[PDB]
């Protein structure tokens, strides 16, 4: 069976600890984007925003490639957590006790080695909520994502626009839009710069 | 690439040069490292030379360090083992083995099974 | 002993990562259905429905087959999580922090290779509860299930009617029926269509 | 050392996936009972009973047997979870998020192969609490236990009377008694009968 | 390196499943003691006492021994959970959902094979709190510890006085002392005697 | 591939159980520091401080070293939890149920063997809050960190000043500074002294 | 199918054709891939040919690539190794190895133990 | 049962019948499957026959399929290999190996080490 | 104890007695089981006798069951293999192997590497 | 250091002294332990001597305990096996193997593959 043969061949010499680049001198480009499905709650007292989000990570492995003619019918493969390399993107401003609130699903790889990873999760993030203009306040909730152990020299984090087509309206809050921006910040831990992408939820209280 | 076949062996005299070829079949040649091994009539298999999947890393046994060279060509899906002045201790059957995205090292656990090798006699 | 022989023979060359089809070009048909046991909580404030549900998934492995004459007395085998392939059916509109709220039980396989899987769980799903007609409101709670990493080209998700034989009447809510429908949707993540089945709980508030 | 020798010898060829019978055609008899230590909470609003319970399962492995003369001083061995076969008894009417609320301890096996598994746990089961006779209401809370993936053709679940010799009396509720009954039910999933043991808690509100 | 050599030598032939006694006919003496750091909460409504406690277990392995002259500079080794044998001491009157509320740390072994194990944890134990004397009531909270699968024939549980120097005073409750006693109880599960040690917290409500 | 070769080479003979020193007679120096991101909650009723904190541990392995010329382009490697030795620094005054509230990330190692570890987490620590001066109370909250199984003879814990540059102002509480101090305490468990570092949060109630 | 037995070996002259049968017993033949192996009097066991459980995938050693063919027949529970013009290098004992739902590859780990083979001499 | 010892071997003529005994010592005989193996003077160790711990399952090599029978007897803790008309290539040293609750299969991984075998010459 | 060395071999006549010694060095002798093996120049290594770390368990090959005895003595850190009447089949080189807290069994995976054995000839 | 090469072998008379060198190439010599092994014309490979990565631990076979010494020198990236009065039994090919931060022990699962050894004859 071609799928069985392909899995056996792909797992050969593969190290999940290894960043899957072909040169080791140029960063692996990881495209990151969001899919906001719904805003579960906006806790004004606890200053915590609870939302349902599907993350979207896309990269190239260059180690999981095959010829579809040599493996007919097998155009994609799926790898569980811990079997192939994955970016360690984390929510920096996470208010959750487990910090990483995402659900680990399979990574989808096609013939040319393009791995795509869509983890769903209910994310609790810290947000400053102002009750100054109580019925007409516009709240800018920040969602900051980035690799924890890979800097810009190793993992080049590119940003893609968040997906809204799957959003469902909230009862108390209107979504005016979720713009994202990519920055590169320096931390006191090391001289390594760290890229990050931040999405601002930018809600409005309903009348 | 999955299946590697050696060719180009024969009878040579001491001090002569010889080129061994390794043709790929059954997969993508650029995804596999190529390792060379000698079997010898009465000895065990021993590492000879290796090249990485990208050709940027090569490994050689000490006896063949300054005398054997290894090269790759993706156009013909071939790996070439060039041999400078040959010595009687090089008389053996050479096998060619693939390693999926290997580093061109001498580690045996990284390579697949050899094909059917070719005898060279000095 | 024939159970030992059968298990040893079945686990030979078996890869849990590989979809157990015989052609690799036709989708694996997975029949999905529901068994409602109890509507445990209808949270109007949090817009979350809590239900006790046994999922039912049925498929064919074609890799776990044997002849009962060669293995007398052994008509079924049971495999734990991670030892054989399972469909990655998930609740899309999950309000639970762990997202996947199901309890992983054994997969039952019979001689012809028919794997049948009944994960029980307490499911928290997002539901719009409208309190317009406070004592006579009819509420449609959607439960959307589908494979996360397998599309219609790989996993053909067929729908079966939900089971209400074991339902335990609630105190505040009547169950009028749970119609299910199968639909194939497109997502911005990939050109792959994704089939899904949605069951609508359709409760009525009691007098 | 004889403990080392016995532990090395018992696990030879042993498969935890295999039901430890000697014929493969007759069911393995599993004796099941309860030990109620405390009624911890009777939630009238959530319709959930919280009790402290030690389950008691007893069976015969026939694969873990030895001669005490050949292993002097070794009359019992203990096996952790996942190292030997265990019955998959579950609480059907479980109100817990994890469903299986029991704590996995060691299985105790003696030279004849008798395995004794005594899982402690805090169990949350669904109960209908009638407050119609508010001061003098007699409540009947069912705890239904059974194997999830084994029918009566494979696992013969037998009932033993529950133990209340360690019951710590509650303040608000008085224990009348915990009768048990063994039944065999057909479910819509399957054509195999499924035995179950149901224990009824039968409390009274204290004055 | 001597530490590397010692770890490699010690893990030889070692079975974590086996009770580490030189003579299988003799019980392993396990010394158990408590270290109360603070009383976190006394729940009068839920009849649950919450305390911060470091357990102390000491025993002899007889399998992890070495000569310090043969391994210079290596006087102690540390083993994680699941790598060496540990006593299964549990809180019998545990009110926690996970039952075992302890945090598994490394076991410290010195050259003579003495293993010491100091797991910290926030323990929730059931306590009957009387409010009859309200302002000046003295409350006795029992913490009962013992091996779950090892009886007095296999594990001789000896008691040591609870450590108190690390206690930090509570606000609402004053500690008068935590005496412990060792008993040997019989249970309906088996004829095996089970030793246990019980510490009574014995608090007083402050003025 | 040089990164693949380096990952293959580094784990040769490596034991995660082994403290990575070069002599076994001198302590491994571990530099510990704090990074306070925000004070999430100050619970006066439960006497618990909830903060978002990144720990910073730095040490030298001496087993993970390589020549960058022999491995061009590979200046750092990253190891998951359980693959290399890590210090067992714990929060002594932890009010969390799981005690260890930190999220395990990759350990970053550079060519000279310097391992750097930055675990983020929401830490719940016990704090005594005085409500005497209701609007003008200055509260000293202690966060005590130290190795659980390694004493000063094996792990020399050095202190570094806490990072504050990433702090986001709280609403109800004003931060005046977080000074740390290193002590070496003796415990009744063993004659081994244990070093620890304590950071005092030292907040002020805002007007 | 659990037990595979080779048959049809004998003595032939160089250039002559030879068919080797491989009968199954002890299981379902359609659930197993059949792998052929040689052993010379003095030599190591070597892969020759393979056919997948469905017959859609075949593998051959390079020496026998153009001369040997492999086929399956579920009616008689048999695998047939057809051999075109043979050479003195083909003189050896041939054995059959089952592989549970194997891919018809040359990997030894995928196959079960060989049965008692049959000698062919050229 | 832990230790199995073969006995009853000797010298016979072609076509004669020979019974081989395997006595158990060191454990419970009913808890172990019994596997028989041959080793020729210059050949590798090969499976011959097996019986399950309960005696309900037996396995045979194809060469001895119709000529060798295997039986158990718990009273004397002995497994018997009966041999009908023997042939030249049955000459070898036979060893007996235990398998803890084995299925009476030919898989070598489920057996313990053989004892010291007995020579049979035909 | 880490390093075990055999001694006391030589040439003896059939029916004579011979005592073999195994001295320990590099560790604590009381923490290790001692196993004896024969190499039998033309044959493979075979188990002979074993003593547990406490000396309470002994294992013997069937050929030497009634003729060889094994003993321990911690004062001199030595293990003694006493041999009653010997047979030509006992002519071989005997090696001594340690097993960390071993049970005195015949399992090869429990023992460490043998030392440089001593030849005995009968 | 990744690649270790032995040198300095030759022909000597009984009772003479001989120094064998082992040069490192391909890595950092101070990160690797050096182990010496003897192949012999007809025997198996056997441990001879070892030195830890720091040079603080050494292991010797009992035959060479008092006659062979081992030393390290990081300046030339070399490991030296000094040999006092040699015996006919010390006639073999010696190979040098690296162990990544090895303890200088005789365990084979800790060293990498040897290079191409050098023959010494006594
Ligand atoms: C595997 O998937 C990738 C990406 O999905 C395909 O490569 C292209 O990638 C770019 C951006 O990464 C997309 O905009 C294109 O739509 C992708 N497709 C094409 C045709 O350009 C790649 O072709 C896929 N490989 C296959 C299908 O074999
Ligand atoms: C294994 O179980 C399956 C499903 O229970 C059996 O499949 C039959 O065909 C369809 C399912 O594809 C059902 O409608 C039938 O009721 C099933 N049973 C029969 C008798 O037709 C399959 O036959 C079973 N195989 C066995 C028992 O060997
Ligand atoms: C091992 O334990 C079992 C069960 O405790 C013992 O079985 C006896 O007989 C029946 C069989 O199930 C039980 O109901 C009895 O309670 C057991 N005891 C008696 C006195 O009958 C069995 O005897 C034990 N084996 C050994 C060697 O002690
Ligand atoms: C290892 O530690 C133990 C316990 O700390 C030491 O045991 C001695 O004897 C009893 C236990 O059998 C202890 O309670 C004593 O405190 C110990 N005696 C002392 C400390 O004098 C044992 O000596 C230690 N072994 C070493 C350090 O090699
Ligand atoms: C690896 O990282 C360490 C620490 O980041 C570097 O150690 C140097 O010395 C101390 C730490 O012990 C720092 O104060 C220095 O700033 C560090 N850097 C320099 C340049 O001195 C070490 O040099 C790094 N090794 C590399 C980059 O190969
Ligand atoms: C790797 O990248 C470096 C610089 O980033 C470049 O100089 C080098 O040529 C690259 N190697 C290959 C093989 O492309
Ligand atoms: C895939 O295989 C076909 C035929 O085997 C070949 O023509 C094609 O070039 C291969 N593709 C690549 C990318 O090498
Ligand atoms: C596999 O499916 C394709 C199309 O779906 C079909 O053409 C082919 O014949 C199938 N293979 C087999 C073996 O039936
Ligand atoms: C099962 O085995 C019996 C006899 O061994 C045979 O007659 C029957 O055809 C087999 N079933 C299948 C599906 O091959
Ligand atoms: C197994 O059970 C069947 C029926 O249940 C019976 O006919 C058979 O004799 C049993 N086998 C043994 C060995 O007792
Ligand atoms: C246990 O062993 C003794 C002596 O070794 C024997 O007499 C007894 O029959 C054995 N028990 C069983 C059940 O075989
Ligand atoms: C083991 O203990 C038993 C009883 O405790 C005793 O009779 C026996 O002699 C002891 N054995 C040894 C070797 O100490
Ligand atoms: C430890 O080793 C030294 C010298 O190697 C020895 O004198 C001492 O007796 C040993 N200790 C024990 C307990 O055997
Ligand atoms: C190890 O430390 C001890 C004392 O701490 C010292 O005497 C010894 O020289 C050190 N070893 C090395 C190799 O530096
Ligand atoms: C690294 O390698 C280069 C050349 O290979 C060498 O000059 C240098 O000394 C090496 N570094 C160390 C620290 O040995």
**How close does chain B come to G75, measured CA to CA in Å?**
31
Q: For residue D199, give the H/E element and its range.
A: strand D194-200
Cβ–Cβ gap B27/A67 under 8 Å: yes
CATH number of J3-116: 2.60.40.10
CA A7 to chain centre: 26
Nearest CA in chain I to J45: I116
Structural contact between residues D171 and D191, judged by C-beta atoms closer than 8 angstroms: no
CA dist D42 and D40 (Å) reads 7
DSSP structure class, residue A114: E
Integer Cα distance of G52 and G59 in angstroms: 9
Strands D173-175 and D203-205, sheet pairing? antiparallel
d(CA D81, CA D67): 25
Query: How many residues belong to chain A?
Result: 207
Tokens of F99: 């005690």
Report how far Cα F148 is from the mean position of its chain's Cα atoms: 12
Q: Which residues are bridge partners to B122 per DSSP?
A: none
Q: CA-to-CA distance for D88 and I52, rounded, in angstroms? A: 40
Neighbours of J31 (CB within 10 A): 22
Bridge-based pairing state of the strands C28-43 and C155-159: parallel
Which ligand approaches the C-alpha of residue H53 most closely?
A: 10
| Integer CA distances (angstroms), F92 to E28, E53, F99, F148, in order | 31, 11, 9, 9
Contact call for residues A94 and A100 (beta carbons, < 8 A): yes
How far is the C-alpha of C47 from the C-alpha of C139, rounded, in Å?
Answer: 11
- Of D159, D157, D156, D203, the closest CA to residue D178 belongs to D203
Q: Does domain I3-121 have CATH number 3.40.50.300?
A: no
Q: Give the single-character DSSP code of G121.
A: B
Contact D190, D131 (CB under 8 A): no
Task: Establish how many alpha carbons lie within 13 A of residue E32's alpha carbon, considering only the half-sphere containing its beta carbon.
Answer: 28
Q: Residue I34: enclosing H or E segment and its boundaries?
A: strand I32-38
Q: Do chains C and I touch (3 or more CB pairs under 8 A)?
A: no
- Among residues G63, G114, G106, which one has the least CA distance to residue G86? G63
Count of beta carbons in the 10 Å neighbourhood of residue B10:
10
Nearest to H57 by CA among H107, H94, H114, H118: H107
Please tell me what DSSP assigns to residue F3: H
Rounded-to-5 percentages of helix, strand, coil across chain C: 5, 45, 50
| CA within 13 Å, CB half, A102 | 21
Provide the token pair at G41: 């009097």
d(CA E59, CA E28): 7
CA D199, D203, D204: angle at the middle one, nearest 5? 160
Strands lying side by side in the sheet with I3-7: I3-7, I18-25, I78-83, I68-73
CA G10 – CA G21 distance, rounded (Å): 12
E strands, F44-189, in order:
48-60, 76-79, 89-91, 107-110, 114-117, 120-126, 138-139, 142-147, 155-159, 173-175, 180-187
CA nearest F123 in A: which residue? A97
According to the CATH classification, is domain B3-120 in 2.60.40.10?
Answer: yes
* Residue partners of F121: CB distance under 8 A and separation at least 6: A99, F52, F53, F54, F55, F101, F102, F103
Domains located in chain C, CATH noted: 2-16+27-205 (2.70.170.10)
E92 burial (CB, 10 Å; 0-12 / 13-18 / 19+) is: buried
DSSP codes of every residue in E37-104: EEEEEEETTTTEEEEEEEEEEEEE-SSS---TTTSTT--EEEE-BTTB----EEETTB-STTS--B--
- Say if residues A92 and A144 touch (Cβ distance below 8 Å): yes
Q: How far apart are CA H43 and CA H49, in angstroms?
A: 18
CA distance C136 to C140: 13
Q: Nearest-5° angle of CA I30, CA I32, CA I38? A: 130
Token pair, residue H86, equals 């023997």
Could you identify the residue written with the tokens 């490639």?
A65
d(CA I42, CA F30): 58
* Distance, CA of H39 to CA of B68 (rounded, Å): 44
Q: Are I48 and I36 spatial neighbours (Cβ–Cβ below 8 Å)?
A: yes
Q: Is residue D19 a contact partner of residue D91, using CB atoms and an 8 Å limit?
A: no
**By three-state DSSP, how is residue A5 classified?**
helix
Q: Closest approach of chain A CAs to the CA of G118, in angstroms?
A: 29
Q: Give yes or no for a contact between A146 and A89, defined as CB atoms under 8 angstroms apart.
A: yes
Instruction: Specify whether the CB–CB gap between A40 and A94 falls below 8 A.
Output: no
Task: Give the residue carrying structure tokens 């076969």.
Answer: D85
| Beta pairing class for G58-60 and G46-51 | antiparallel
Residue closest to I90 by CA, chosen among I118, I121, I61, I60: I121
**DSSP-derived secondary structure for I56-114:** --EEE-GGGTTTEEEEEETTTTEEEEEE-S--GGG-EEEEEEEEET--S-S-GGGS---
What is the CATH number assigned to the segment(s) H3-105?
A: 2.60.40.10
Q: E97-120 burial string, b = 16+ CB within 10 Å, else e?
A: bebbbbbebbbbbbbebbbbbbbb
H28 CA distance to ligand 11 centroid (A)? Answer: 8
Token match 């001669």: residue?
Answer: D67
Question: In a 10 Å sphere around its CB, with 0-12 CB exposed, 13-18 middle and 19+ buried, how is residue I67 labelled?
Answer: middle
- Phi then psi dihedrals of residue B102, to 5 deg: -70, 160
Q: Which residues contact B51 (CB under 8 A, 6 or more apart)?
A: B33, B34, B57, B58, B70, B71, B72, B79, B104
Return all residues near D122 (Cβ < 8 A) that are at least 6 apart: D40, D50, D51, D52, D53, D101, E94, E95, E96, E97, E99
- Cα(G81)–Cα(H101) distance, integer angstroms: 38
Which is it for strands B32-38 and B92-100: parallel, antiparallel or unpaired?
antiparallel
Residue D148 CB-density burial (10 A; 0-12 exposed, 13-18 middle, 19+ buried): buried
What are residue D119's phi and psi, to 5 degrees? -75, 125
A22 SS3 class: coil
Give the CA dihedral H48, H53, H58, H63, nearest 10 degrees.
0
Query: HSE on the CB side for B38, CA within 13 Å?
Result: 21
One DSSP character per residue, D11-27 reads: TTT--TTS---SSSSSP
Residue A133 burial by Cβ neighbours in a 10 Å radius (0-12, 13-18, 19+): exposed
Distance CA C31, CA C156 (A): 8
> Quick one: which of C118, C112, C107, C20 has its CA closest to C75?
C112
Contact G102 C63 (CB under 8 A): no
Q: In this structure, are strands G78-83 and G18-25 parallel, antiparallel, or unpaired? A: antiparallel
**Cβ atoms of residues C49 and C39 within 8 Å:** yes
CA of D108 from ligand 3 middle (Å) equals: 13
CB atoms within 10 A of CB D128: 14
Nearest CA-CA partner of I19 in I67, I56, I61, I53: I67
Distance F152 CA to ligand 14 centre (A): 16
Please give the structure tokens belonging to residue H79.
């497994």
From C30, C31, C37, C33, select the one nearest C161 (Cα to Cα): C33
Instruction: Give residues with Cβ within 8 angstroms of G30, minimum separation 6.
Output: G53, G54, G74
CA distances from E173 to A11, B60, E39, E79, H68 (A): 60, 76, 8, 38, 83
As a whole number of angstroms, the distance between CA A160 and CA A32 comes to 6
Spatial distance between the Cα atoms of E66 and A52, rounded to a whole number of angstroms:
56
Return the HEC string of chain H.
CEEEEEECCCECCCCCCEEEEEEEECCCHHHEEEEEEEECCCCCCEEEEEECCCCCCEEECHHHCCCEEEEEECCCCEEEEEECCCCHHHCEEEEEEEEECCCCCCCHHHCCCCCCCEEEEC
Phi, psi of A162 (to 5 degrees): -70, 155
**How far apart are alpha carbons G87 and C156 in whole angstroms?**
52
| Closest C-alpha to G93, from G38, G46, G35 | G38
Domains in chain H: boundaries: 3-105
Kindly report the number of other CB atoms within 10 A of residue C158's CB atom.
14
Tell me the two tokens of residue D60: 């015969």
Ligand 14 pocket check: which of F19, F23, F154 to mutate, most ligand atoms within 8 Å of Cβ? F23
Token pair, residue J89, equals 């039994």
Let me know how long chain D is: 207
Residue contact A1–G103, C-beta within 8 A = yes
CA dist., res. E21 & res. E63, Å (int): 8
Q: Do A108 and C149 touch (CB under 8 A)?
A: yes
Backbone angles phi, psi at E4, to 5 degrees: -60, -45
Specify the residue with its C-alpha closest to ligand 9, atom 1. C67
Technique used by the depositors: cryo-EM
Report the C-alpha gap between B56 and B33 in whole angstroms.
11
Q: Are D128 and D100 in contact (CB under 8 A)?
A: no
Ligand 3 site, residue D110, Cβ cutoff 6 A: yes
The verdict on whether residue F21 carries a ligand-binding annotation is yes
DSSP F133-146: SSSS-EE--EEEEE
Terminus-to-terminus CA distance in chain A, angstroms?
61
Q: What are phi and psi of D57, to 5 degrees?
A: -120, 135
J61: Cβ–Cβ under 8 A, 6 or more apart, which residues?
A: I115, I116, J46, J47, J48, J49, J106
Question: How close is the Cα of B49 to the center of ligand 8, in Å?
Answer: 43
- The answer to whether residues E72 and E80 touch, using CB atoms and an 8 Å cutoff, is no
Q: How many CB atoms lie within 10 A of CB C139?
A: 19
- From CA J121, how far away is CA F207, in angstroms rounded? 92
Distance CA I89, CA A52 (A): 78
**Burial class of residue D203, CB neighbours in 10 A (0-12, 13-18, 19+):** buried
Which of J:3-22 have CB within 8 Å of B? 3, 5
Does I99 contact E13 at a Cβ distance shorter than 8 Å? yes
What is d(CA D168, CA H119) in angstroms, rounded to the nearest whole number? 72
Specify burial of residue D198 (Cβ count, 10 A radius: 0-12, 13-18, 19+).
middle
Per the document, the length of chain J is 122
Cβ-based neighbour number of residue I106 at 10 Å: 22
Evaluate whether chains C and F are touching (3 or more beta carbon pairs less than 8 Å apart). Answer: no
Neighbours of J80 (CB within 10 A): 17
Contacts of J116 in chain B (CB under 8 A): 46, 61-63
Atom of ligand 2 nearest to the CA of C110: 1
Is there a contact between F196 and F186 (Cβ–Cβ < 8 Å)?
no
Taking alpha carbons only, the member of D12, D98, D101 closest to residue D63 is D12
I34: nearest Cα among I65, I86, I72: I72
- Number of residues written out for chain H: 122
């Amino acid at each position: 069976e071609f799928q069985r043969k392909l899995y056996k061949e792909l797992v050969k010499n593969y190290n999940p600890l290894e960043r899957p680049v072909a040169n080791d001198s140029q960063p692996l480009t990881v495209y990151f984007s969001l899919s906001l499905l719904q805003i579960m709650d906006v806790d004004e007292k606890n200053q915590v925003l609870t939302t349902n989000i599907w993350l979207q990570m896309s990269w190239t492995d260059h180690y999981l490639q095959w010829n579809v003619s040599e493996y007919p019918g097998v155009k994609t493969v799926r790898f569980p957590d811990g079997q192939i390399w994955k970016p360690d993107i984390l929510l920096y401003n996470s208010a959750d006790e487990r910090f990483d609130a995402t659900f680990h699903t399979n990574v989808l790889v096609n013939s040319s080695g393009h791995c795509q990873y869509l983890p769903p999760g209910i994310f609790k993030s810290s947000c400053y909520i102002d009750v100054r203009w109580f019925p007409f306040d516009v709240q800018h909730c920040k969602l900051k994502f980035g690799s924890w152990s890979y800097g810009g020299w190793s993992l080049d984090l590119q940003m893609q626009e968040a997906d809204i087509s799957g959003y469902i309206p909230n009862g108390e809050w209107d979504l005016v839009g979720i713009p994202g921006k990519r920055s590169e910040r320096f931390y006191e831990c090391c001289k390594e710069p760290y890229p990050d992408v931040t999405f601002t939820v930018t809600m409005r209280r309903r009348t | 690439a999955v299946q590697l076949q050696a060719s180009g062996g024969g009878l040579v005299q001491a001090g002569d040069s010889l080129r061994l070829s390794c043709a790929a079949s059954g997969g993508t040649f650029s995804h596999y490292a190529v390792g060379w091994f000698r079997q010898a009539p009465g000895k065990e298999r021993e590492f000879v030379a290796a090249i990485s999947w990208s050709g940027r890393s090569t490994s050689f046994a000490n006896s063949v360090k300054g005398r054997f060279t290894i090269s790759r060509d993706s156009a013909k899906n071939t790996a070439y083992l060039q041999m400078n002045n040959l010595k009687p201790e090089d008389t053996a059957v050479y096998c060619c083995a693939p390693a999926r995205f290997g580093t061109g090292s001498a580690a045996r656990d990284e390579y697949d099974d050899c094909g059917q090798g070719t005898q060279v006699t000095v």
